[PDB]
Amino acid sequence: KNVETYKIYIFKVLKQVHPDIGISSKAMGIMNSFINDIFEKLAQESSKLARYNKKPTITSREIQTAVRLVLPGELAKHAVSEGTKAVTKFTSS
Amino acid sequence: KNVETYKIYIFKVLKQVHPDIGISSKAMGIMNSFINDIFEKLAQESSKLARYNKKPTITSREIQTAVRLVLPGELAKHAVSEGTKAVTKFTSS
Amino acid sequence: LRDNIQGITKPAIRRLARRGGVKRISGLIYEETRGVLKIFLENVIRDAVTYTEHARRKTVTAMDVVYALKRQGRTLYGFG
Amino acid sequence: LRDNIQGITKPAIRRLARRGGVKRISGLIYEETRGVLKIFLENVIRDAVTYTEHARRKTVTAMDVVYALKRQGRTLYGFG
Amino acid sequence: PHRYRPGTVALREIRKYQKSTELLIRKLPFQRLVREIAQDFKTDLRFQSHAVLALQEAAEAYLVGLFEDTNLCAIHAKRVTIMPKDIQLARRIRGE
Amino acid sequence: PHRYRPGTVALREIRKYQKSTELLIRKLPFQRLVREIAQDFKTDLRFQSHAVLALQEAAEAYLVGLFEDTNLCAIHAKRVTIMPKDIQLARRIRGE
Amino acid sequence: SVSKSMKAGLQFPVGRITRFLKKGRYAQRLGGGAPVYMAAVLEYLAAEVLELAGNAARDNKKSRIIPRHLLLAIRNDEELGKLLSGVTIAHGGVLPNINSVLLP
Amino acid sequence: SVSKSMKAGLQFPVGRITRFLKKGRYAQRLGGGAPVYMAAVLEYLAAEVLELAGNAARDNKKSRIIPRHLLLAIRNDEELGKLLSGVTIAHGGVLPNINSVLLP
DNA sequence: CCTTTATTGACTCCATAATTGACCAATTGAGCGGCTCGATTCAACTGTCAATAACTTCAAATGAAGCAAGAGCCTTATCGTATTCTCCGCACGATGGTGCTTTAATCCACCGCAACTTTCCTCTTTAATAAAGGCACAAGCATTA
DNA sequence: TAATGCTTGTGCCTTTATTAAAGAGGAAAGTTGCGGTGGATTAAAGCACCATCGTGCGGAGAATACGATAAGGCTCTTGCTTCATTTGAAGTTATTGACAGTTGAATCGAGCCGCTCAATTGGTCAATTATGGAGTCAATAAAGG
């Protein structure tokens, strides 16, 4: 059975930030677990936000509010800025 | 809009335990919040249990395991005993 | 609004310490206790306001405060 | 199995204290540190076993331990 | 004149305030403080009264628990007077 | 003869063990301890090896954090020697 | 028509709990006995807390349960105190305790 | 066929994240831009952690990121340390710190 | 121990408001049928965990000796406490105004469903070079003089 | 300061194993079309939150006399550290076997979906009884003698 992991995409991101630095298998597993954990946190917060407001759908606004609730401070600011940029790029195309 | 609470059923339970003792409105709200919080905890634990085992349904077994995970010690033992009694009574009828 | 943190008077902090079982209180506690309190509120109100901003409302309800508290492991019964 | 709690030897506890930044260690620490450790394990293994009992399995996996730890606010990366 | 020794009326106050369930902070100054703090997150905010009451009760519970921890830390150092370092140690161990 | 004063080799060990990432508890005694503890919850249990490794790493992380808190408590009472009361106070403030 | 709560011998609303479980979308499907188990557990917990609170109220020579009695019942019990350790009861106060060092 | 990640200018799998969001049943319906927003946020967090870890690895004169470098990057950063305060990194060790009192 | 004084709890009378009881509707739980999926059982394959034996050598146990750190005792001086006077702004009651929250209708717009395509991401296999093991070695440090 | 043991940091050979690179396929993402359900807009009631004014009185602020508590200094004695020797138990390697986890199929049970409807529960209003406000007395405890 093929297992879904971010080990591909994470590696891509690494080659965009540090082209000459590799990553070990243990560190790759730790990074994959980190991505999974943050995904679950954001998704659960978005679900709670949708349920509190009696909304059946999760939009980018729910994700933005979940990012503000979960990530601290400047991390949340930069993440919101990147998410808004990506959504604008996706919609404009 | 009609607001839905447990304030009826809890009162019934009180009259079964302490027939001569009443309950105030503030204590009524506190008990209702307590019941809602425990319901949410057990339901979320059951959902996590079903998701972990790739099961689409929540059975009384998921609820029993969630009770064991959430309630501590003798509380969990007695709650499991009560739930098993209720399920047996419901099925036998 | 300014200086409102000074509205948490020394007798109020002393009463809160008495409820905590404190028999003797140093002179500089009242300052520290204020700052600590401020931090706590800034952690809750922010979250509460966030909820108020998501519901597209302008009034902060008791539900917003209860959810903001529950988000931090400070569940509060009696306002649900 | 009995007496296996004594397998957590005094040098092991001393190394754990050194990694924690401890310079001097009292004589009775090694006993207390054992009991504390035992309690911790009993809180995790139980939960882990519970998961193993729900999946109708007889073998405790790393997933069971990871979930049992996450249930207690002790999230552990590297075994996911 | 009748003078109580230090720490006697303090013990009486400990017994009196641990038995009551009332709020210990004045309501209007706390309301002003909450509005001041919230004005830095979103200007022109309105507060439902029960929201401010919930905030006050949560803050008072937090401070009472913190003072219990502070008293434990003070007694650890062979003292009866709580000091700012005790609050700092309690908040550090608590994870704050 | 050449002898180090007390607390020097202790500081060197602090620097050495804070730099390494290895496990500090022996694997086989810990495995026996885990099997002993689990035998009281369900007889005839089997343990996957990575499960025991995860348990060991979690337990070691917990003990190291507890010892950091214990060292803070010991420093608070104007001492350098950690004592059982320090562990008890740290676990009390931590909520255990 | 025999209500499910009466069929299970409970006072709590098995049907309403079924609706709450389905509305929350905790799983795609819901078993027949899951709401019954839910109702039984909730009823037992409510009965336990109310027993302790009523005993506390009787000890105080009061015939009505107030949040103070609920807090006393919760904090004077090991299991309930462990379950509700991180919970604040409104208008509940604190457990009366003074450290032995502070006493004269 | 232009992939949604290429459309949004991301390296992360917008489609796979959409599948994960739908499979997790977090809501009845999923908006068009919610997976894109989530992918952007996850990509940014991964980039931040990897930048800090690569800097830590370079400071140690190593060309490979190991769990020790990830832990050093996490603990030496205020906001990442706040986000991952209750997280244990396997084979990560601890941040080297000795109290001033213990020093000679 | 005694004696005086301040505090607090019990006891009762009166107000009071707060919980209990009763009624109308509203809305939702129970019933019944059809149907598709899922979870139960069975079986085989196959992965791996418990157990064995052997050998080694490194870390644990134990003791000696040493030293310095915790704990008890004493002294002091300063600083939190109990009390009183005075002052001041919190709180309760009544009232106006307005803005903003909720509800309902309407329209449009966008997302789930279903099937086809096509492409990219994941086991399996092979290579190669970064780093641990080991050896040699320099130097910053601690220790006693 | 200074000589000297000493441990840790630094430089180089080795190898290896742990990561970089590549392929077949198959599982999953992108596309297209439809249609219905949900979000966005607008208007209106009413209600709820802000601001005003008055007052009067209980709580806050400031000063005073002071005692007792925290902090520093001293001493000592014992408990923990450092080091050396002996051993005994963990660690690694190779092997066995049997248990149990996983995958694949059939199938019978069971829960979703629609629609009716009637039985249960919630909003609204009157009301009495447990509880608070206030006054008075009796018991308890603290502080000086």
Short mmCIF file of C-alpha atoms in Angstrom, two decimals, chain B residues 4-6 9-14 16-24 26-28 30-31 34-44 46-47 50 55-61 63-64 67 70-75 78-87 89-91 93, chain G residues 4 6-14 16-17 19-21 23 25-38 40-55 57-58 62-67 70 74 77-80 82-84 87 89-91:
data_model
loop_
_atom_site.label_atom_id
_atom_site.label_comp_id
_atom_site.label_asym_id
_atom_site.label_seq_id
_atom_site.Cartn_x
_atom_site.Cartn_y
_atom_site.Cartn_z
CA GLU B 4 -32.83 23.38 24.04
CA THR B 5 -31.28 22.35 27.37
CA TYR B 6 -31.06 19.35 29.69
CA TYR B 9 -33.93 15.71 32.54
CA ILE B 10 -31.33 16.77 35.11
CA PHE B 11 -34.20 17.87 37.35
CA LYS B 12 -35.76 14.43 36.95
CA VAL B 13 -32.45 12.85 37.94
CA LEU B 14 -32.29 15.12 40.98
CA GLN B 16 -34.59 10.45 41.81
CA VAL B 17 -31.55 11.08 44.03
CA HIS B 18 -32.64 13.83 46.45
CA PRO B 19 -36.45 14.07 46.36
CA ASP B 20 -36.56 16.91 48.92
CA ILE B 21 -33.72 19.06 47.49
CA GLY B 22 -34.23 21.62 44.73
CA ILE B 23 -31.73 23.32 42.43
CA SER B 24 -31.23 26.99 41.56
CA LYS B 26 -27.43 29.28 38.18
CA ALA B 27 -26.66 25.73 39.33
CA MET B 28 -29.04 24.50 36.62
CA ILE B 30 -23.74 25.07 35.41
CA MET B 31 -24.98 21.46 35.32
CA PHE B 34 -21.19 20.32 32.42
CA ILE B 35 -23.39 17.82 30.56
CA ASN B 36 -22.77 19.59 27.24
CA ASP B 37 -19.00 19.61 27.83
CA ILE B 38 -18.85 15.91 28.71
CA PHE B 39 -21.04 15.05 25.70
CA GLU B 40 -18.70 17.00 23.41
CA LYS B 41 -15.60 15.34 24.88
CA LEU B 42 -16.97 11.81 24.52
CA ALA B 43 -18.33 12.44 21.01
CA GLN B 44 -15.02 13.89 19.81
CA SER B 46 -15.48 8.53 19.58
CA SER B 47 -14.97 10.36 16.28
CA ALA B 50 -13.59 5.75 14.42
CA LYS B 55 -14.51 2.82 10.54
CA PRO B 56 -17.42 4.86 9.13
CA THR B 57 -19.83 4.21 12.04
CA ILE B 58 -19.77 5.04 15.74
CA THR B 59 -21.08 2.06 17.70
CA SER B 60 -21.58 1.55 21.44
CA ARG B 61 -18.07 0.05 21.41
CA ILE B 63 -18.55 5.12 23.03
CA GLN B 64 -17.32 2.59 25.62
CA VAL B 67 -15.60 6.59 28.14
CA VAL B 70 -11.94 10.22 29.08
CA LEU B 71 -13.35 9.35 32.51
CA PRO B 72 -10.79 8.49 35.23
CA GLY B 73 -10.71 5.20 37.10
CA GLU B 74 -13.76 4.20 39.11
CA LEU B 75 -15.78 6.84 37.27
CA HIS B 78 -19.17 2.65 36.83
CA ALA B 79 -20.04 4.59 33.66
CA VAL B 80 -19.16 1.57 31.51
CA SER B 81 -21.32 -0.61 33.76
CA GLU B 82 -24.26 1.78 33.41
CA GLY B 83 -23.88 2.06 29.64
CA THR B 84 -23.68 -1.71 29.19
CA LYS B 85 -26.79 -2.13 31.36
CA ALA B 86 -28.68 0.45 29.30
CA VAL B 87 -27.65 -1.08 25.97
CA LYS B 89 -32.01 -3.26 28.34
CA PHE B 90 -32.56 -1.41 25.06
CA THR B 91 -31.67 -4.43 22.91
CA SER B 93 -36.81 -4.92 24.50
CA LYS G 4 -36.25 5.12 23.28
CA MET G 6 -38.12 4.64 28.33
CA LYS G 7 -37.12 1.54 26.33
CA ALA G 8 -33.57 1.85 27.69
CA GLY G 9 -34.81 2.69 31.20
CA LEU G 10 -33.26 6.16 31.24
CA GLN G 11 -34.29 9.69 32.15
CA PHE G 12 -32.10 11.37 29.52
CA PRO G 13 -33.30 12.05 25.94
CA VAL G 14 -31.91 9.21 23.81
CA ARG G 16 -32.30 14.23 21.31
CA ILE G 17 -28.81 12.83 21.91
CA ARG G 19 -30.02 14.12 16.87
CA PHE G 20 -27.08 15.90 18.50
CA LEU G 21 -24.71 13.11 17.43
CA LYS G 23 -25.92 16.97 13.64
CA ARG G 25 -21.18 14.84 11.98
CA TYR G 26 -18.86 12.88 14.27
CA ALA G 27 -19.07 9.95 11.83
CA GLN G 28 -20.77 9.07 8.56
CA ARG G 29 -23.10 6.59 10.27
CA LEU G 30 -24.30 6.18 13.85
CA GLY G 31 -24.93 2.85 15.54
CA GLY G 32 -28.21 1.94 17.14
CA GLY G 33 -26.89 1.73 20.69
CA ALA G 34 -24.41 4.61 20.60
CA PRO G 35 -26.98 7.26 21.69
CA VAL G 36 -28.23 4.86 24.37
CA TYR G 37 -24.69 4.44 25.74
CA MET G 38 -24.25 8.23 25.53
CA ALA G 40 -26.60 6.27 30.12
CA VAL G 41 -23.13 7.73 30.70
CA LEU G 42 -24.45 11.30 30.86
CA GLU G 43 -27.24 10.25 33.25
CA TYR G 44 -24.75 8.48 35.53
CA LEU G 45 -22.42 11.49 35.62
CA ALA G 46 -25.30 13.88 36.33
CA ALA G 47 -26.58 11.59 39.09
CA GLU G 48 -23.14 11.37 40.70
CA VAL G 49 -22.55 15.13 40.64
CA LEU G 50 -26.06 15.81 41.93
CA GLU G 51 -25.70 13.26 44.74
CA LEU G 52 -22.49 14.91 45.92
CA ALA G 53 -23.93 18.42 45.54
CA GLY G 54 -27.09 17.51 47.45
CA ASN G 55 -25.02 16.02 50.25
CA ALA G 57 -26.17 21.32 50.45
CA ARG G 58 -27.61 19.20 53.28
CA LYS G 62 -29.72 24.33 52.81
CA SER G 63 -32.51 22.72 50.77
CA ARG G 64 -31.40 24.20 47.44
CA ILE G 65 -28.29 23.50 45.37
CA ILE G 66 -26.28 26.61 44.46
CA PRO G 67 -23.01 26.85 42.46
CA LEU G 70 -21.54 22.16 43.08
CA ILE G 74 -16.56 18.70 42.61
CA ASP G 77 -14.12 14.28 45.18
CA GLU G 78 -10.98 12.72 43.72
CA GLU G 79 -12.50 11.40 40.49
CA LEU G 80 -14.68 14.44 39.74
CA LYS G 82 -9.60 14.96 38.27
CA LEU G 83 -12.23 15.09 35.52
CA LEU G 84 -12.97 18.80 36.06
CA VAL G 87 -12.81 23.96 34.87
CA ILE G 89 -17.40 27.15 38.23
CA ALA G 90 -19.13 30.53 38.09
CA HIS G 91 -20.01 31.93 41.53
#
